[PDB]
Design an enzyme around this catalytic site. Structure first.
Site, mmCIF file in Angstrom:
data_model
loop_
_atom_site.group_PDB
_atom_site.id
_atom_site.type_symbol
_atom_site.label_atom_id
_atom_site.label_comp_id
_atom_site.label_asym_id
_atom_site.label_seq_id
_atom_site.Cartn_x
_atom_site.Cartn_y
_atom_site.Cartn_z
ATOM 1 N N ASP B 215 0.820 -1.203 0.000
ATOM 2 C CA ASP B 215 0.000 0.000 0.000
ATOM 3 C C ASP B 215 0.857 1.258 0.000
ATOM 4 O OD1 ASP B 215 -2.754 1.379 0.597
ATOM 5 O OD2 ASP B 215 -1.527 2.046 2.278
ATOM 6 N N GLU B 245 1.558 -0.586 -5.005
ATOM 7 C CA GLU B 245 0.622 0.491 -5.349
ATOM 8 C C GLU B 245 1.445 1.771 -5.386
ATOM 9 O OE1 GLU B 245 -3.213 3.190 -4.048
ATOM 10 O OE2 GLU B 245 -1.423 2.890 -2.840
HETATM 11 C C1 LIG Z 1 -6.258 6.906 -2.182
HETATM 12 C C2 LIG Z 1 -4.827 6.986 -2.657
HETATM 13 O O1 LIG Z 1 -4.402 8.344 -2.440
HETATM 14 C C3 LIG Z 1 -3.150 8.671 -3.037
HETATM 15 O O2 LIG Z 1 -3.212 8.633 -4.428
HETATM 16 C C4 LIG Z 1 -3.133 9.692 -5.275
HETATM 17 C C5 LIG Z 1 -1.826 9.565 -6.032
HETATM 18 O O3 LIG Z 1 -0.746 9.622 -5.113
HETATM 19 C C6 LIG Z 1 -1.685 10.709 -7.018
HETATM 20 O O4 LIG Z 1 -0.660 10.396 -7.979
HETATM 21 C C7 LIG Z 1 -3.003 11.164 -7.685
HETATM 22 O O5 LIG Z 1 -2.930 11.014 -9.099
HETATM 23 O O6 LIG Z 1 -4.245 10.583 -7.239
HETATM 24 C C8 LIG Z 1 -4.272 9.558 -6.262
HETATM 25 C C9 LIG Z 1 -5.627 9.595 -5.560
HETATM 26 O O7 LIG Z 1 -5.839 10.865 -4.953
HETATM 27 C C10 LIG Z 1 -2.062 7.739 -2.511
HETATM 28 O O8 LIG Z 1 -0.863 7.936 -3.249
HETATM 29 C C11 LIG Z 1 -2.487 6.277 -2.579
HETATM 30 O O9 LIG Z 1 -1.497 5.480 -1.948
HETATM 31 C C12 LIG Z 1 -3.854 6.038 -1.958
HETATM 32 N N1 LIG Z 1 -4.279 4.603 -2.066
HETATM 33 C C13 LIG Z 1 -4.114 3.711 -0.858
HETATM 34 C C14 LIG Z 1 -3.893 4.496 0.414
HETATM 35 C C15 LIG Z 1 -4.738 4.466 1.438
HETATM 36 C C16 LIG Z 1 -4.345 4.809 2.845
HETATM 37 O O10 LIG Z 1 -3.708 3.737 3.518
HETATM 38 C C17 LIG Z 1 -6.188 4.066 1.278
HETATM 39 O O11 LIG Z 1 -7.056 5.103 1.685
HETATM 40 C C18 LIG Z 1 -6.492 3.639 -0.154
HETATM 41 O O12 LIG Z 1 -7.701 2.896 -0.184
HETATM 42 C C19 LIG Z 1 -5.339 2.809 -0.695
HETATM 43 O O13 LIG Z 1 -5.684 2.223 -1.942
#
Ligand SMILES: C[C@H]1O[C@H](O[C@H]2[C@H](O)[C@@H](O)[C@@H](O)O[C@@H]2CO)[C@H](O)[C@@H](O)[C@@H]1N[C@H]1C=C(CO)[C@@H](O)[C@H](O)[C@H]1O
Ligand SMILES: C[C@H]1O[C@H](O[C@H]2[C@H](O)[C@@H](O)[C@@H](O)O[C@@H]2CO)[C@H](O)[C@@H](O)[C@@H]1N[C@H]1C=C(CO)[C@@H](O)[C@H](O)[C@H]1O
Lengths: 460, 460
Positions: B215, B245
């Site tokens: 994550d 991710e």
């Molecule tokens: C939800 C997501 O947020 C962040 O993602 C952003 C990216 O970093 C950017 O490049 C941009 O383009 O949009 C994305 C969405 O706003 C973050 O980087 C991710 O890691 C995150 N996803 C995981 C993180 C979490 C917290 O532990 C969870 O809320 C989420 O469900 C996960 O999939």
């Protein structure tokens, strides 16, 4: 000696030739390879085994008939420089019992030794008519079905010669300049692609090699290279080994362009560090090369090959004369890359007494994660293998001196093995080294050229 | 159905949840997994299994104790949202029985749900005091030895919070911005790194997971990331699966920065093509994506996940409303990448009937070399899988419409299987296609959204 679960044994490659070396190699290859297998060599790169234009005088790179492995009477001889196909098949069976995989030196880029001239409409004279007895015998519809095409190797099989294009041709999508020498093969022609996919299957599944060293492969169309590797891999049950001789400025770029996970490449640029090492003045803290790059997993490391070290130095490369064992230690024990032991080093230069123990050190000890040493100096480089939790007795703390001073120096290094006693597998420093509870011990290395390496591994 | 050699079976992943879905998953998972095993799913990305700040209402990303898998009463519950650890171990046993690998969704970047505040000298109050009963139970000196360090998780285990560094702390070497949310964990501290290695071994070798979905990992120190992956991989006899991710602009550069061959990454960029596809007006000749890059072999492809497809659209992402079966065909049947089938599509959106046949199409037929099609139009994309020589009956010719005109169109395509009769495994086009001596057939596809994909496979 620690006993390693077979599937995890490090791959240690041995280049089983150098320039003009070993006429009649095939008959003698079982004997040469028997002790090498005991040391821990698990693969050998054999010289190009297909008939070349100059017969028994050819090293194999002036290749005439890829389907003639010393079987048919052409170019003045039946056997190649190294022997007949029968002797090669017996060699391959011997190596197979010894546990060694044999890699084929395939020369895809060019042909030499046409049987007769042709007049090419709108161009002129060319040496492009190739008779290819071996092709007539083995590239048949019966053997290859869908991969078989009825066509003759004449000028329409080639892009051109002497850097001139034949009518309606183009050089292809090559990462390097397309033309190197000879009659440049046209891998943009569908029937040639398919015949080469059939030949790749023949070499692995029928003849019995286990991989390829791909000669001058950066002068060859990149899309064909990818499609042929991909086809041969899908077509074979074993995990076939592919290493590119991609002697270009940006080998990382070359690998990204071919774009197949199965292709490795020779680490030409790491050798420049060994060139500096040979001076006896190299700052031992800095190392470059493919094996410390974002393609390090796909690197095939070496100290010299038949182009870099050769009587007369025909390509004008700076030589690696001194500190060669420290160079070999660097490629053999570090976690990344598949290293190549060079026959001229082992044999002609007579480095076998010291190299034997380094091959064993890689064979039986260089396992577990790898760690660099924050405490490297301008004169000493050190490196650690944790070892295997499953196999007590693995792991190593290696040190190499790039200086000729005399005497020893010791370094406090974390082996990651608490309360463990080590000893120098090379026999260059006597005594033992006992680590403390957090894993640190004080390991010495001799500050000479002649004996300036040490590989501390745990006691029995 | 073709019988694929066990070690050659394609990996097909199923994300076994979506946002807020499946309270009590662990008890229900073996029941859910049995039909999916039959279709050809081979791995399951399970939701974050460790105890979250919000207890039974935690999807799992507000992670509190990584050693508490539903075994200890903290944060107001013993069981997580998905069950007790006893029920998790039973679900893992049943998955083993079904031949399905389980992937743990690890949340390394941050912690939430601190038990109390601390007064950080020269800073002020911070929610940093973590009691961590699971850690007390399992991260012991007797269990882990060299990797065990005596320290408590207080403010000195974190870099900061609210994008503000704690004293003496730095954010680390992170590819993305370092701060996302919660208490940002300091992976530049030795003891925290060593504990996480211990935990990785625990998840694989003791709990019995087979891999990891990492994550928010672009926010986590790249060097820890590489060292952890490599340590876990060396400490595990099986070939452990790792998918990042890394939701960043340059996923290629992220994978080159971490620089371990074991790390895959999710192909966020390819989803932009499916957004275009959904419009009914995409030019079907053009495709991007990590799956079509120099890191294609490390791509994990998907159409939607719990962040991109969620009631309310929390992150503002464009939605793939239509042509979703065509998207799934594309990620499932092409030669590169490992695909993900999303539980929200299969279950909530009711795509199981059609996805069932495309999963079986991947499991049973999508083998051997892939080929793009030169005759792609603005309206149709096609693609070929050559099949396996060793396994008669494999291979496929897929086409996908991005138009909703009605009727059918046929396309002359080399299937690479001469004199072979195909039929549409999807059943969307009736009848058979017969290829000629050179392998070419005239393959139709329906020009509709709801039926506009066809997957032609050899008759048995
Ligand atoms: C939800 C997501 O947020 C962040 O993602 C952003 C990216 O970093 C950017 O490049 C941009 O383009 O949009 C994305 C969405 O706003 C973050 O980087 C991710 O890691 C995150 N996803 C995981 C993180 C979490 C917290 O532990 C969870 O809320 C989420 O469900 C996960 O999939
Ligand atoms: C001998 C060698 O020549 C070419 O290599 C040159 C590189 O292209 C350049 O980057 C330059 O810096 O140095 C190299 C030497 O001049 C060529 O690319 C190589 O493929 C070639 N090596 C193989 C080719 C042969 C067949 O033509 C053999 O003669 C040779 O032994 C092979 O190792």
């Amino acid at each position: 000696l620690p006993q390693i679960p077979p599937q995890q044994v490090n791959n240690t490659m041995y280049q089983a030739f150098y320039w003009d070396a070993y006429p009649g190699l095939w008959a003698n290859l079982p004997a040469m390879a028997a002790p090498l297998a005991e040391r821990g060599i698990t693969s050998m790169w054999l010289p190009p085994a297909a008939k070349g234009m100059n017969g028994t005088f050819s090293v194999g790179y002036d290749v005439y008939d890829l389907w003639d492995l010393g079987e048919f009477n052409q170019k003045g001889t039946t056997a190649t420089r190294y022997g007949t196909r029968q002797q090669l098949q017996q060699a391959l069976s011997a190596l197979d019992q010894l546990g060694i995989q044999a890699y084929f030196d395939v020369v895809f880029n060019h042909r030499m030794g046409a049987d007769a001239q042709e007049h090419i409409p709108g161009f002129g004279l060319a040496w492009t008519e190739y008779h290819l007895q071996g092709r007539q015998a083995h590239y048949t519809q019966q053997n290859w079905g869908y991969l078989w095409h009825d066509f003759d190797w004449n000028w329409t099989a080639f892009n051109g010669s002497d850097n001139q294009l034949y009518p309606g041709k183009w050089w292809g999508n090559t990462f390097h300049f397309p033309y190197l020498m000879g009659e440049d093969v046209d891998y943009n022609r569908f029937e040639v692609q398919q015949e080469m996919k059939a030949w790749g299957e023949w070499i692995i599944n029928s003849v019995g090699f286990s991989g390829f060293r791909m000669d001058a492969i950066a002068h060859v169309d990149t899309d064909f290279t990818r499609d042929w590797i991909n086809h041969v891999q899908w077509a074979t049950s074993e995990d076939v080994f592919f290493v590119a001789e991609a002697w270009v400025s940006d080998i990382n770029g070359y690998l990204d362009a071919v774009n197949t996970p199965h292709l490795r490449a020779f680490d030409f640029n790491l050798r420049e560090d060994f060139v500096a090492l040979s001076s006896g003045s190299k700052d031992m803290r800095w190392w470059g090369g493919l094996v410390n790059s974002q393609h390090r997993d796909r690197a095939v490391t070496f100290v010299d090959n038949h182009d870099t070290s050769r009587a007369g130095n025909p390509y004008g490369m700076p030589q690696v004369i001194n500190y060669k064992n420290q160079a070999y230690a660097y490629i053999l024990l570090r976690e990344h890359g598949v290293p190549t032991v060079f026959a001229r080093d082992y044999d002609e230069f007579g480095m076998a007494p010291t190299l034997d123990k380094l091959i064993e050190a890689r064979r039986y000890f260089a396992y577990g994660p790898g760690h660099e040493y924050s405490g490297n100096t301008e004169a000493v480089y050190a490196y650690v293998r944790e070892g295997l939790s499953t196999v007590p007795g693995t792991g190593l703390v290696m040190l190499i001196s790039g200086r000729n001073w005399g005497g020893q120096q010791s370094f406090t290094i974390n082996s990651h093995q608490p309360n463990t006693t080590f000893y120098d597998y090379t026999g260059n420093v006597s005594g033992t080294v006992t680590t403390n509870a957090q894993g640190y011990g004080s390991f010495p290395v001799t500050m000479t050229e002649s004996t300036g390496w040490s590989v501390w591994v745990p006691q029995s």
